[PDB]
A paper describes a structure:
Identified from African donor 17 of the IAVI Protocol G cohort, the PGT121 antibody family consists of three primary members (PGT121, PGT122 and PGT123), and additional antibodies from this donor described recently. One of the main characteristics of the paratope is a 24-residue HCDR3 that forms an extended anti-parallel β-hairpin with either a type-1 β-turn at its tip for PGT121 and PGT123 or a distorted 310-helix at its tip for PGT122.
On the other hand, PGT121 interaction with a complex biantennary glycan could be observed on the glycan array and in the crystal structure. This glycan sits directly in the open face of the PGT121 paratope and buries 530 Å2 of antibody surface area. Alanine-mutagenesis experiments in the PGT121 paratope were performed to show that the residues that contact the complex glycan in the crystal structure are indeed responsible for binding complex sugars on the glycan array. However, it appears that PGT121 reactivity with a complex sugar is not absolutely required for HIV-1 neutralization, since antibodies of the PGT121 family can neutralize viruses that were produced in the presence of kifunensine and, hence, lack complex sugars. Modeling of the “PGT121-liganded” crystal structure in our EM density reveals that the complex glycan is adjacent to the N332 glycan. Our model therefore suggests that the open face of the PGT121 antibody could possibly accommodate another glycan on gp120 in addition to the N332 glycan, potentially from the gp120 V1/V2 loops.
Author numbering:
A (entry chain B): 1 to 82, 82A, 82B, 82C, 83 to 100, 100A, 100B, 100C, ...
B (entry chain A): 9, 11 to 67, 67A, 67B, 67C, 68 to 95, 95A, 95B, ...
């Protein structure tokens, strides 16, 4: 059937041009209108614009000055170009076939109709971050053992994986030899533009005496591997 | 943003009251999934969409568009957007709604909160991070306020949105970033997680 796939630089420095590509398979772009929609982390679904071979093409007024939707029949692709990108342009960008209908509520004669558009087929969306952030490896801090929050006989210890960029970070413990009781929290995107995550593992309190706990933080984006011994 | 049990009927209002005549589309945005058209032309269900999903009819004027989901199931937990097209109102480029329908497919679970103080290492590096780790709560909505001694702390707070852990319960993080000064000076700092009316509050102190 029709499948859509948005692709493009997942990360874009502010003022640079966000350009995305919707690759349509099992349908001609020429058979449909095409919309781009973004979900900005702020407020939900922003219909960016739509484009047809017709030339029936319109852009969100908030983006009209900056955006260029565009069809490439040979490449069978819808393309979005958003110049002068800012953090507000961060979000998941969806390509969608746009269908349309007439809503005829009076009589055509009195012009009592309108064309409405709707998107039946959406691509998965490609996340786009507009960030001044440059690749930064993580400071990894030990979260020394704490019994307060865990069940009896056990304690939580962790590694705070602080101020890295971009995603992702991988944390294992004792080189994967400790999987039981491990909870790696998803990262937080901070004001810094930087991510921090924590990974706690809950272990026998008895073992703090003897068992060595090393979290193995891996942040391939910066080719950093940290192995934090977490002591009590 | 509303919660219903499976089987209950979800009614979702979205957008202003109708001015002229409308074709309202509804879209369902399941977490991580692509959105899907679930209603077009006010009431018309696209092929595939179950009869459980009804839309609101065009007239009378002054009507609020309303998605009705009956016999709600877990698959219905999503964001729901109407896209209103009204004859006398300019074309909406931002989908109305974003109304998050939560399907309470399990009972309320109390948040487990772990709070870690700044590591020495961190303080050595002239930084200080309080880590609040919140886990195993349901539904996945918490509120996290930090307190220095007993005063609320505005800045330094970065809190993740919740995320499903494997056991279908939710987890979250809140970090409080401090200067070592800020940390060493207040007698305590508290991570207060409010979930579903109840509050867990962990506290740590520079004296450790
Ligand atoms: C748009 O987005 C869509 C939808 O996105 C999804 O939905 C969103 C909301 C979110 O959840 C996203 O994560 C989703 O992706 C997306 O389409 C999706 O694409 C996904 C992956 O890209 C698919 O994921 C799969 O999902 C299934 C479950 O699907 C059910 O639920 C789905 C989602 O919930 C739903 O979509 C479906 O309707 C369905 O109801 C899941 O099971 C899959 O998991 C496998 O695959 C991943 C990697 O793909 C892997 O990480 C997992 O561990 C798992 O791998 C399989 O693991 C099992 C168990 O371990 C293995 O079984 C064992 O196999 C061995 C074989 O041994 C080997 C060997 O090492 O020797 C393997 C060798 O390589 C092989 N050698 C050779 C030469 O072949 C051999 C060989 O196989 C035999 O030895 C020959 O005899 O052996 C033995 O058989 C053992 O006995 C056996 O136990 C498997 O082998 C292993 N296989 C694989 C393939 O790795 C997976 O996660 C989504 O389903 C899919 N959804 C849809 C609708 O398409 C889409 O991409 C996006 N659109 C685009 C294009 O942009």
């Amino acid at each position: 059937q029709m499948q859509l796939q948005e692709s493009g630089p997942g990360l874009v420095k502010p003022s640079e041009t966000l350009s995305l590509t919707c690759s349509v398979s099992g349908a001609s772009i020429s058979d449909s209108y095409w919309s781009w929609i973004r979900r900005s982390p702020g407020k939900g679904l922003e219909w960016i614009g739509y484009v047809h071979k017709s030339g029936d093409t319109n852009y969100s007024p908030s983006l009209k000055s900056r955006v260029n939707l565009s069809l490439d029949t040979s490449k069978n692709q819808v393309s979005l170009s958003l110049v002068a990108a800012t953090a507000a342009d961060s979000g998941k960008y969806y390509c969608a076939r746009t269908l349309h209908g007439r809503r005829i509520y009076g009589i055509v004669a009195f012009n009592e109709w309108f064309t409405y558009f709707y998107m039946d087929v959406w691509g998965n969306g490609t996340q786009v971050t507009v960030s001044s952030a440059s690749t930064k490896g993580p400071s990894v801090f030990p979260l020394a053992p704490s019994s307060k929050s865990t069940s009896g006989g056990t304690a939580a210890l962790g590694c705070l994986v602080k101020d890295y960029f971009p995603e992702p970070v991988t944390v294992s413990w004792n080189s994967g030899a400790l999987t039981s009781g491990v909870h790696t929290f998803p990262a937080v995107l901070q004001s810094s533009g930087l991510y921090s995550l924590s990974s706690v593992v809950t272990v026998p309190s008895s073992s703090l005496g003897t068992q060595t706990y090393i979290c193995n933080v891996n942040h391939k984006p910066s080719n950093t591997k940290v192995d934090k011994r977490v002591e009590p | 943003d509303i919660s219903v049990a499976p089987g209950e009927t979800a009614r979702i209002s979205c957008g202003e009251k109708s001015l002229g005549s409308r074709a309202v589309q509804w879209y369902q945005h399941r977490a991580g999934q692509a959105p899907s058209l679930i209603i077009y032309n006010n009431q018309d269900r696209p092929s595939g969409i179950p009869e459980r999903f009804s839309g609101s009819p065009d007239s009378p004027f002054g009507t609020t568009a309303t998605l009705t989901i009956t016999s709600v199931e877990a698959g219905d937990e999503a964001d729901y957007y109407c896209h209103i097209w009204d004859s006398r109102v300019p074309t909406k480029w931002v989908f109305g709604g974003g109304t998050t329908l939560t399907v309470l497919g399990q009972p309320k679970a109390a948040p487990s909160v772990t709070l870690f103080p700044p590591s020495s290492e961190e303080l050595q590096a002239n930084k200080a991070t309080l880590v609040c780790l919140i886990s195993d709560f349901y539904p996945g909505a918490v509120t996290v306020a930090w307190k220095a001694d007993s005063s609320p702390v505005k800045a330094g707070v970065e809190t993740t949105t919740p995320s499903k852990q494997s056991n279908n319960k939710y987890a979250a993080s809140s970090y409080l970033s401090l200067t070592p000064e800020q940390w060493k000076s207040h007698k305590s700092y508290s991570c207060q997680v409010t979930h579903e009316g109840s509050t867990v509050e962990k506290t740590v102190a520079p004296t450790e």
